[PDB]
Amino acid sequence: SYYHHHHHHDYDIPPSSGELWGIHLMPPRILVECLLPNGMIVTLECLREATLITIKHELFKEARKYPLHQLLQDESSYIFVSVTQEAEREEFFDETRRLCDLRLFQPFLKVIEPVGNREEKILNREIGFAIGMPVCEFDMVKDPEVQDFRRNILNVCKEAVDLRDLNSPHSRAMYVYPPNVESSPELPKHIYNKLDKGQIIVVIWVIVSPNNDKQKYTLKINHDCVPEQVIAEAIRKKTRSMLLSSEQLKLCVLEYQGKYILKVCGCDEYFLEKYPLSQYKYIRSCIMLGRMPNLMLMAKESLYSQLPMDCFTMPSYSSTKSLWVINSALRIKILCATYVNVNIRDIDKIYVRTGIYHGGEPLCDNVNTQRVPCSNPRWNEWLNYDIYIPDLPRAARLCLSICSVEEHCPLAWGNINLFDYTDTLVSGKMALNLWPVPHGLEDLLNPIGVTGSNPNKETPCLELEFDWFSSVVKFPDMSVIEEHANWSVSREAGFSYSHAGLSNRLARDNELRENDKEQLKAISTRDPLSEITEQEKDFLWSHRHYCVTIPEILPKLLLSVKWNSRDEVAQMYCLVKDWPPIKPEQAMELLDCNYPDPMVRGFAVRCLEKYLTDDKLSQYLIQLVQVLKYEQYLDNLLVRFLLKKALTNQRIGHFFFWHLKSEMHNKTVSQRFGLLLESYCRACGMYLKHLNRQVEAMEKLINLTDILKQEKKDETQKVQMKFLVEQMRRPDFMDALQGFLSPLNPAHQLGNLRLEECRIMSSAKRPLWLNWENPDIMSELLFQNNEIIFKNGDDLRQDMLTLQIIRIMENIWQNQGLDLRMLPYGCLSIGDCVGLIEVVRNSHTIMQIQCKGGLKGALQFNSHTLHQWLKDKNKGEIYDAAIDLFTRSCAGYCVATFILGIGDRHNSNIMVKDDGQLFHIDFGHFLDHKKKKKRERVPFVLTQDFLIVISKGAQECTKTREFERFQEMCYKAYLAIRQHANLFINLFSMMLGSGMPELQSFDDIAYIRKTLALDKTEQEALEYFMKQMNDAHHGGWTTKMD
Amino acid sequence: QDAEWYWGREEVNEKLRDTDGTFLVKMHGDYTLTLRNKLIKVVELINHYRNESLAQYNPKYPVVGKKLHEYNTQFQEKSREYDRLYEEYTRTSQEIQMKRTAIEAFNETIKIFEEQCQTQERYSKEYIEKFKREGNEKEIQRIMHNYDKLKSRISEIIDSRRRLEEDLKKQAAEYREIDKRMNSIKPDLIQLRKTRDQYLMWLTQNEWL
Ligand SMILES: O[C@H]1CC[C@H](O)CC1
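A: This is the predicted complex of the input protein with trans-cyclohexane-1,4-diol.
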């Protein structure tokens, strides 16, 4: 009756390692084989947590009691060495290190006299720990490019380190502690109005004798006055006296004035150059949060006291035929895919598909015939490509893929640069090991995949052969391409008076039409995804010379060039040579996959070098590290840019380290990023040692959560938590998890752990809630305790991006004068699904609000409870502002959410703060990843709960002015973002690199088009949004302010 | 109006996704021809160009409600199966490589012990021949005891490695077996997926989905 008695007969109810190989956490007591110089083994029993100093010191006592003692030197003549889990022979110089922390593979220690006269140099260990792969792993890479990268990139490192010791010690201090400054000194109109006519009360602190006692000095100075001005005013007030005349004050100010700089009380930030106070980020937060800034007068020679020297040393490792001469078309010999995993049952026949590419194809795509199908597959064809060898553009690439049979289906793919990094057309035999097809890719060929072979051996190795021209064929010089252009253009001037397909060339001459000059700028403003027709392409390409008037057209123009015509391409290289520079936000487009050319990308880097500020760089750093993947060659201008900014400003450096290090698991970038990270680590200065303490911290937490998630599952939180605390007590953890800098923001130091507050959260993933003491001198003035969540299970980098996107949305809105406080809490991926999330204290899930306001007998939860709970928290004039905040926050998060189309959101992932700000967490899938199963969804659906709060407290909340205000915010926000839709496209476009399933190819990003309504006009877009907002709510939004 | 290929961007590219030669058709333009993806800025003009090429104009294939729920639950079942097996694939890829590194480590470890039993031979049998009579059976046993550890230990390590190597092959077998099935699922994933969109196309001429 239930199941028509149908029986399902089939149905039946029945990670990297840590401290030693195959075991997460070495036993508290353990036996280690000590291999001595005299050939004797002595097995020492000794504790997990014991140093090598202790182990050595004991070993040479216990050795005496074994034969051949007199054949051992003093213990001090020796250094331990063993095989590690990365499988190299590591020498153990830092004998303070603990037996558990050595990453030992087998528990044994060989005794030796130290090999290298340069012990200094064998602290490459520090580098490959930071990197998470030993440096020696690079020295035995055969590949010239790699070696060449390594030697050539030191050019950049040297130049960086030069910029640093320029005005030592100030510039060193300037490196380490770069000023944290908002973009523009101009203040928004709503921030100003919080100042009673341009002035902030500030509080400067001082420390006297014995250095324990502290002293307030509450100034009221102009917002735009600078650190040096502020430092004077403090020292004035500090040292006025009845014993000092007026003129005698000035003279004691002037000696004192610049022996000090301004710290921020409670965190390692400083105000170290000529900047409006307002412009430092700390100040402008205080203004918005209604807070009185607390700075500290810090004595330069106590600050410069703490800064080291960088200590940079150079590493140990310190006739041709022009392409266009080649009179032939391209042909490539396929040979034999040696390995394949196919059922001869299920699959009929298999072939190799092929194509040449520049992001898009420059010839008809082709295959070889359906041969030796499945069983032992081989074809010995010459594929013949209809493009002449001189019309290959610099950046050209073969893209191939073995396939199955309209039963068309990919098996294994791989791409090859037709030119090597030395400009040399590829000729001879190649071994190309292939990549598996990703999730979302059903397509046959995959050209936005990685250029290069898989390093993995046991993979479909499709080998092949490239036509040979008796000589190393090279790509022509610029001198040569410049002349070909000049001749191609002097050639154009005298053509047959009429030319058909008039698309080719002008026919208007030095007088182009005015109706046309209007069609061009209307193209120029259309977003990067609004695909451009063949008419428009040709039309753009013809007027290319007028296009220099509208520089921002460039992205479109470049996608109109026929890259398979060296005539066109050569000409386009001369436009680009001295094309007018463009805005960094617009030039970023040109470093995505759609622009693989080295001159184009070179241009974009020149834009950034000029216009892109260390502020804006570090906002978009995630997109610039991602976009490195689409650079053909290791060594390039973009890499040289970033690496130099990294070594110039330690706040960039920090994230640049972690973003690279984050993705080291991913073999599509391990080589590239590892190599770059080597450079950074070799030249970044003492921060390496700081970074290594963060790196060692995270590994310990990684191992801790690894054991919780396996074997310690199916135990009560009780049992786990007792294990957690037990473990965190052991010395190795105390050592490792206390004296360091938050990766979330290294300006915050993390002191001792308070284990009282350290706990496992309730989630299945066993995320850790960690709490640290703020060991700042003025800790109390900022926060005495600092807590962040470590999460072993989830891929944080989707969230990382939306939090970025929000942050940017906030800035757009506010810096256009319209206050919509968002809360883009800190997030950071540091590994394969490993990360850190900034805790926001005094915030609760709406669910919590409702369980804490739910009445005795179960019944149902009350809509007002949120409001009543909020009222309880904000009483008086304080109430009224808290609603405006909830409203301003609820508006921004409504629009951001809807545009991004994030996961549906409900009581257990919306959060309200005591002070009344709403903010979202756990975004999950962003560009509507779950639609795969024209939904144009509203993820933030405002129930009564929210509406009640929005209109100060009422029944039928749809009909209050308060709500009409709220909507009007939602519309003015919606549109302001719409006007910067180019950026948002481009931010998502640059992230196609990373293997996020939610960013697979450009139509993924196309959601943001429909939702922003870019094809329509803005008045329609407004209405589209109201239409969208009305049917999710069922009322309110079509009316117009009655 | 019906006009087959004529519909009248996002869903243009999605209908164009996986099909070479296939096509379909205010103050900006009117009707655009998206020939696979080449956009070209009514029934008169396309009947000419289905017969003839587009080179002479510009130098360089005119393609129930409960069944939607039934074929959607197959597709969504198959996608998990595909998603499951792609982890099993990627995990095994890792686990395998972790073994290979371990095997290198093992080998490298063994070297140090082979080197050690050798190293001891040198200094032990230099100290047998010097003296001989002094501490004769006493010394030489307690040196031979230590040696008989060193070698029988090496023995375990070489067994420890072998055991790993044999596991690597079974792992590699299973690794092959996963890709194999993936490659047989993959074609039939697409046909399920493709028919689901033709079924859902005819209707438009959530609770199921
Ligand atoms: O028109 C085509 C569509 C796909 C893009 O990524 C490249 C150009």
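The longest helix of chain A spans residues 877-900. Chain A touches chain B through 69 residues (CB under 8 Å).
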